[PDB]
Design a protein around this motif. Structure first.
Motif: not given
Ligand SMILES: N=C(N)[C@H]1CC[C@H](CNC(=O)[C@@H]2C=CCn3c(=O)n(CCS(=O)(=O)c4ccc(Br)cc4)c(=O)n32)CC1
Ligand code: NA
Lengths: 8, 30, 252
Positions: C42-47, C86-89, C98-99
């Protein structure tokens, strides 16, 4: 970066 | 697991051929 | 990838290029787990700290590639994203725990010799392989050095290191959803993933059925290849049930 077809 | 036909590579495993470094992996598997 | 070699053609048929629409750019690596699903970090989409928050409409998925920049005319397939999950956590606020993020394709991709899904581990596979000293394999179009770019896909085979070791190598707090891999300064073998490699696969080959399994996702590390530092990956078997939930709750 080579050019990708606009269909996309 | 994560597919069905999953993890079997058309160019290698499906043809019984090995990639150049897969033996190092296989050789650590203790 | 730092200190690796070019991938053989067809070697990692589940590799996926995460590609942005404008500027046309390589954003991350990824993997195809079926014909309509891709898994990445998820760091790919949201950071947020980096002001990073990509939507379905900001990108494309390129599957079937070897070359990083060229468009692989009758070889690569380009997909549009239907939905991102994205994982909720996902804890971007402290240690990236939880990436993992799922992307569901607008239409299923057809397999070929260069496009084929990786297996998701079961509890017993996770159980026999994920052992200190066993080597897994990482791939990506990423940096060749920490501080350039390959023309084609790189690969490196890295050993799974003992937790403590991982633990004493950083100031960051490590969680059971993480694992580190890399050689020790003493081992006299090196290599890591680097920037541009995020979201790629850390996969292993089963000795029992000889199928390849995606064990980890590329996540974080300090620098690329530093002596006495290891790369950290998302432990895919531990987030396994979130995975089945979404796909069941939403796809296939
Ligand atoms: N060298 C490697 N094996 C890994 C190195 C780095 C890459 C990409 N990483 C990142 O995208 C990730 C993602 C977001 C932010 N970020 C960092 O601030 N740091 C580098 C510094 S750090 O490792 O101490 C760190 C780790 C987690 C967090 Br949260 C902040 C900082 C890092 O690695 N991350 C993947 C390959
Ligand atoms: Na290292």
């Amino acid at each position: 970066f080579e050019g990708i077809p606009g269909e996309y | 697991s994560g597919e069905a036909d999953c993890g079997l590579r058309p160019l290698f495993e499906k043809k019984s051929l090995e990639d150049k470094t897969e033996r190092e992996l296989l050789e650590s598997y203790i | 990838i730092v200190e690796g070699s070019d991938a053989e053609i067809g070697m990692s048929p589940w590799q996926v290029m995460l590609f942005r629409k404008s500027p046309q750019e390589l954003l991350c690596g990824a993997s195809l787990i079926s014909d309509r699903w891709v898994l990445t970090a998820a760091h790919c989409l949201l950071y947020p700290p980096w002001d990073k928050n990509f939507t379905e409409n900001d990108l494309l998925v390129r599957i079937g590639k070897h070359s990083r920049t060229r468009y692989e005319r009758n070889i690569e397939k380009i997909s549009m994203l239907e939905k991102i999950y994205i994982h909720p956590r996902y804890n971007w606020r402290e240690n990236l725990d939880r990436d993992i993020a799922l992307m569901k394709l607008k239409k299923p991709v057809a397999f070929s010799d260069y496009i084929h899904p990786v297996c998701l581990p079961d509890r017993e596979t996770a159980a026999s392989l994920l052992q200190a000293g066993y080597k897994g394999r990482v791939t990506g179009w990423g940096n060749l050095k920490e501080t350039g770019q390959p023309s084609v896909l790189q690969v490196v085979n890295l050993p799974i290191v003992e937790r403590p070791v991982c633990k004493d190598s950083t100031r960051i707090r490590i969680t059971d959803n993480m694992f580190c891999a890399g050689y020790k300064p003493d081992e006299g073998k090196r290599g890591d993933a680097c920037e541009g490699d995020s979201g790629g696969p850390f996969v292993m080959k089963s000795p029992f059925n000889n199928r390849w399994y995606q064990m980890g996702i590329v996540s974080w590390g300090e620098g690329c290849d530093r002596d006495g530092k290891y790369g950290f990956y998302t432990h895919v078997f531990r987030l396994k049930k979130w995975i089945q939930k979404v796909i069941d709750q939403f796809g296939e």
